[PDB]
Design an enzyme around this catalytic site. Structure first.
Site, mmCIF file in Angstrom:
data_model
loop_
_atom_site.group_PDB
_atom_site.id
_atom_site.type_symbol
_atom_site.label_atom_id
_atom_site.label_comp_id
_atom_site.label_asym_id
_atom_site.label_seq_id
_atom_site.Cartn_x
_atom_site.Cartn_y
_atom_site.Cartn_z
ATOM 1 N N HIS A 40 2.931 2.738 4.461
ATOM 2 C CA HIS A 40 3.455 3.475 3.282
ATOM 3 C C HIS A 40 2.390 4.191 2.483
ATOM 4 C CE1 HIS A 40 2.625 -0.182 0.480
ATOM 5 N NE2 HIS A 40 2.504 0.736 -0.416
ATOM 6 N N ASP A 84 4.477 -2.599 8.196
ATOM 7 C CA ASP A 84 3.736 -1.717 7.265
ATOM 8 C C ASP A 84 2.239 -1.714 7.583
ATOM 9 O OD1 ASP A 84 3.367 -0.085 5.053
ATOM 10 O OD2 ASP A 84 3.467 -1.743 3.641
ATOM 11 N N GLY A 175 -1.786 0.488 -5.876
ATOM 12 C CA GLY A 175 -3.197 1.039 -5.779
ATOM 13 C C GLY A 175 -4.036 0.180 -4.863
ATOM 14 N N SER A 177 -2.468 -1.434 -2.403
ATOM 15 C CA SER A 177 -1.756 -1.272 -1.088
ATOM 16 C C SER A 177 -2.687 -0.757 -0.007
ATOM 17 C CB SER A 177 -0.592 -0.240 -1.143
ATOM 18 O OG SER A 177 0.456 -0.736 -1.994
ATOM 19 N N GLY A 178 -2.543 -1.279 1.165
ATOM 20 C CA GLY A 178 -3.395 -0.839 2.294
ATOM 21 C C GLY A 178 -4.624 -1.663 2.379
HETATM 22 C C1 LIG Z 1 5.690 4.503 -1.293
HETATM 23 O O1 LIG Z 1 4.943 4.045 -2.430
HETATM 24 C C2 LIG Z 1 3.575 4.238 -2.537
HETATM 25 C C3 LIG Z 1 2.964 5.267 -1.801
HETATM 26 C C4 LIG Z 1 1.608 5.485 -1.888
HETATM 27 C C5 LIG Z 1 0.825 4.702 -2.703
HETATM 28 C C6 LIG Z 1 1.413 3.670 -3.451
HETATM 29 C C7 LIG Z 1 2.792 3.411 -3.387
HETATM 30 C C8 LIG Z 1 3.297 2.379 -4.172
HETATM 31 C C9 LIG Z 1 4.125 2.752 -5.186
HETATM 32 C C10 LIG Z 1 4.606 1.862 -6.107
HETATM 33 C C11 LIG Z 1 5.536 2.348 -7.249
HETATM 34 C C12 LIG Z 1 5.513 3.964 -7.491
HETATM 35 C C13 LIG Z 1 5.238 4.418 -8.976
HETATM 36 O O2 LIG Z 1 5.792 3.828 -9.896
HETATM 37 O O3 LIG Z 1 4.469 5.362 -9.154
HETATM 38 C C14 LIG Z 1 6.921 1.803 -6.845
HETATM 39 O O4 LIG Z 1 7.620 2.466 -6.090
HETATM 40 O O5 LIG Z 1 7.207 0.709 -7.317
HETATM 41 C C15 LIG Z 1 4.238 0.519 -6.004
HETATM 42 C C16 LIG Z 1 3.399 0.049 -4.979
HETATM 43 C C17 LIG Z 1 3.026 -1.328 -4.886
HETATM 44 N N1 LIG Z 1 3.485 -2.260 -5.717
HETATM 45 C C18 LIG Z 1 2.852 -3.324 -5.253
HETATM 46 C C19 LIG Z 1 2.968 -4.620 -5.769
HETATM 47 C C20 LIG Z 1 2.221 -5.669 -5.148
HETATM 48 C C21 LIG Z 1 2.299 -7.007 -5.589
HETATM 49 N N2 LIG Z 1 1.497 -7.916 -5.068
HETATM 50 N N3 LIG Z 1 3.172 -7.338 -6.521
HETATM 51 C C22 LIG Z 1 1.405 -5.311 -4.029
HETATM 52 C C23 LIG Z 1 1.309 -3.988 -3.557
HETATM 53 C C24 LIG Z 1 2.059 -3.035 -4.210
HETATM 54 N N4 LIG Z 1 2.195 -1.769 -3.992
HETATM 55 C C25 LIG Z 1 2.939 1.029 -4.059
HETATM 56 O O6 LIG Z 1 2.148 0.630 -2.991
#
Ligand SMILES: COc1ccccc1-c1cc([C@@H](CC(=O)[O-])C(=O)[O-])cc(-c2nc3cc(C(N)=[NH2+])ccc3[nH]2)c1[O-]
Ligand SMILES: [Ca+2]
Length: 223
Positions: A40, A84, A175, A177-178
């Protein structure tokens, strides 16, 4: 990373920042030409930034290389986030050293209770955005499958595992993520998703890398 600490420059030599004019996801260097991240986080125009610490200032040790191809897993499902994982091949190899090093892939999956290190430049708040300039670290245990499934009934597949703290306050976040979940020196997870960040009873969910070892190897081999 919410509730973490400053890692210290280059103490996590396999961490990479995926930049498209701004940091948007993390990744892990697995060999001098390949990085594993999350499907993602895919997009075009990605520049991989190795040897980073403060992402807004060049301080030295940084290496910026464009990605040649990004290979999203063929069975990646964007609605469930099953599978993912993504491989990015760099345009040229990185020069490895002590500040830029690859991490090893596992030979077994890890058990619940194993402690791991999670890092990234993702949000540090559970309520609002606060993105840091330097890399943050967090030590978290892998949870049992029943605790993971209780937290996310019907949303956990066998390619995911949970790690974190059910009491909240410490977790990975957007942020991050990955990026890497390293346990006993092996890449066991990839920061994938969660409900909010550091919320009580809602731990982080990670891609279970041990189930993609053969795929990573084969895909890297045939490319
Ligand atoms: C498809 O979403 C994405 C694409 C590229 C980069 C980040 C994201 C991404 C987006 C979003 C926001 C988008 C916004 O509000 O701007 C959403 O859709 O909730 C959230 C994540 C994300 N939330 C996360 C929460 C956790 C955790 N441990 N609780 C871990 C990784 C996460 N990655 C997340 O990885
Ligand atoms: Ca920098």
């Amino acid at each position: 990373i919410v509730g973490g600490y400053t890692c210290g420059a280059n103490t996590v030599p396999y961490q990479v920042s995926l930049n498209s004019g701004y940091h948007f996801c993390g990744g892990s260097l697995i060999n001098s030409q390949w990085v594993v991240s999350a499907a993602h986080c895919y997009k075009s125009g990605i520049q991989v930034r190795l040897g980073e610490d403060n992402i807004n200032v060049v301080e030295g040790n940084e290496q910026f290389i464009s990605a040649s191809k990004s290979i999203v897993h063929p069975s990646y499902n964007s609605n469930t986030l099953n599978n993912d994982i993504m491989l990015i091949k760099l345009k040229s190899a990185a020069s490895l050293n002590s500040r830029v090093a690859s991490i090893s892939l596992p030979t077994s999956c890890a058990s619940a209770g194993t402690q791991c290190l999670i890092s990234g430049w993702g949000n540090t708040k559970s309520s609002g955005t606060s993105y840091p300039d330097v890399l943050k670290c967090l030590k978290a245990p892998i949870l049992s499958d029943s605790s993971c499934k209780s937290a996310y009934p019907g949303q956990i597949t066998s390619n995911m595992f949970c790690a974190g703290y059910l009491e909240g306050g410490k977790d990975s976040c957007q942020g991050d993520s990955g990026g890497p979940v390293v346990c006993s020196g092996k890449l066991q997870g990839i920061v994938s998703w969660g409900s909010g960040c550091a919320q009580k009873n809602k731990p982080g969910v990670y891609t279970k890398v041990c189930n993609y070892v053969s795929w990573i190897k084969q895909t890297i081999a045939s490319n």
